[PDB]
Amino acid sequence: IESRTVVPLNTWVLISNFKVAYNILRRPDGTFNRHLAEYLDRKVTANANPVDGVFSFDVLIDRRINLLSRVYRPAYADQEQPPSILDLEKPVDGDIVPVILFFHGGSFAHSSANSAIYDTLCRRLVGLCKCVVVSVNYRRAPENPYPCAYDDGWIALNWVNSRSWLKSKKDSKVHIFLAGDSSGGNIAHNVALRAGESGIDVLGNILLNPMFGGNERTESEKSLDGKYFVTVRDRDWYWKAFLPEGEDREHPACNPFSPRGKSLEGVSFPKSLVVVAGLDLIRDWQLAYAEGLKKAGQEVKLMHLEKATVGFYLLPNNNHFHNVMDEISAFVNA
Amino acid sequence: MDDELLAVLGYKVRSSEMAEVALKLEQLETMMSNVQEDGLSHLATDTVHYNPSELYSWLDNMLSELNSTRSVILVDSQENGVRLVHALMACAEAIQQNNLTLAEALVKQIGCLAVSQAGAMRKVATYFAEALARRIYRLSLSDTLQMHFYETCPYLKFAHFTANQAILEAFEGKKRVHVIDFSMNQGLQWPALMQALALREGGPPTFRLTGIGPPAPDNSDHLHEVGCKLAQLAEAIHVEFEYRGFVANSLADLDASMLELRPSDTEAVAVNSVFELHKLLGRPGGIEKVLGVVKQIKPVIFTVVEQESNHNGPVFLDRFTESLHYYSTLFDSLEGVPNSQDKVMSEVYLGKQICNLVACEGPDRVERHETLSQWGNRFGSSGLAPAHLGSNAFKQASMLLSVFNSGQGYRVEESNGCLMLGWHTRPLITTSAWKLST
């Protein structure tokens, strides 16, 4: 009844349904029911016909690992005929065209790039930020544990950077922004680290409720346990399913600012935009991540929504969604 | 009226049933807090789920048991592939604009370009070029091929497995059953269903089989051989078996009087169709007659397997480009199979399909495929209702794919109570089941 007074009814229904289904799908012995999970998941197909000014198509980036992505582009104003092959990868017309590499959430185990909740989000991003979106389909745990997702993101980043029809006409370069949801924010942070290590230049990072943790128990974890759709038990289960064998939560893939982690001081890192919800039980870790970014000497903008829960961006019926969209649009079109 | 915001996300909830649904969710959580892991394991293992999109019925089930779209996928090609597509569409447009003089030069150029390529694009361009040449020059054995296609590609096995699972579910608690097959062919579908019937709880029923086939040019009696071969295995596992066959040039020549039916209260009836209904679209009034006959039979289940692609448009160029997309996807999927004679025979089979699709016209054109929405519209107009498939059929199909293909990227999807088989994110074929509308 506490979570019933902070969200609209349909949002509550959506999150509760996800919660009960994921309760069904988890086994105590670290085992996942993939067949039923894929049966229950709702999915959509790519459509080359522009709907609401957006059309999409799929590309097989890698064949050895079956790595695939979906591309969302604005509709052509000059060509009234809907796009087809020989016209899907037509060069962009614009002095500056930003491109967003997006990673979906699911705590490293659920959802896909063709899930109906993320297709809508990508289309909304295209419609509101006036950009091109590439959504990766990365491998999931516990069948594909760490570090499969990071490698998938790296390969997708190289593929995006090597496209000649995505180059802007002001400097003949691709303007790239990495964006992430939940575990997608974790993937985006690690891929940004690797890109900075290599010769690729990333312009910005967007992190919506990034997934981070640690060995100790924070105050928000002890105070908000089980009250807003998330419990400590499932967080522990997912971290165990993702991490290597016999590894605790001080691993750098869990805590970016652990003693075993790498220092970010004096390192080429993109500017970050981190959004934190007030009614999330792991908000302390996200605030600590933002503070660690600020202390290392990096540029970071922090958006703290004090009365927001998880998945406030899946429906356009709240002020948090509109404000976050406004700030993202201002962030990428600076 | 549904919830638009939730409908966009893939869930069907009535506006007036919101709070009720919410209440059910409450009652579930409390339940899962007082049952621990026994009920959770029961729900994850023994329960069968249907139609996840409709949350109301799904929540009721859990509570009871705890107590024009154009889909394209691009694969990495070279500049020669771009030029090949350019030339193929240019030749198609030249044919449509009734040039017939630029078309010959364009088709020769297509052949010249396809000479210097590699991959599936070479074979696709070759077959489409032969089809285009046949069309412009008209303007101015099968059993072995199907056996090879069955051996090499996973579509026929998927169709048979899903249809058999649906039939088995519909035949539960019966003592006398009858199966009417519109796609008898060599009878590769029935032994598994018959074994499943013989391995049932409570006792197997009595089996009757009807098989309809085209008239062979040599008038061979293959149906009798198939029936006797089936009868051997029938008597092997102690099942009372009766078999009977017909020859007909079209499914629109059938009627329920020649089917020799028995009372419905005495015998249940199941109708099957795998890749056979789209051939009735050449006849101006064929599908309606066949669906009327199906309604007159009054079966307990009608199982349909079809190809998911819009290849029955009124404009030739649109059909050409859609079919080019579809068959390029098919050959890209077929790339991964190791080389063998069955593979080349399957390629010949697909090339014959392409030739018929592109060249022929009118009743002579039989490869008139459609999508699930159009088939559903036709079936609903005929007076039928969907029969949703469950999670067990999905799991069986997935395990079949993970065994017979392993490395190749074939996927199973659920949509509107129907099952879809596709390559990566591109659907290829669809299985559905139907019953009499109330």
Ligand SMILES: C=C1C[C@]23C[C@@]1(O)CC[C@H]2[C@@]12C=C[C@H](O)[C@@](C)(C(=O)O1)[C@H]2[C@@H]3C(=O)O
């Ligand atoms: C076990 C889970 C996983 C949740 C939190 C939850 O505790 C309950 C519901 C999940 C979830 C469902 C859909 C979205 O992917 C997500 C980000 C959300 O908002 O809610 C998902 C979110 C997450 O992936 O962190």
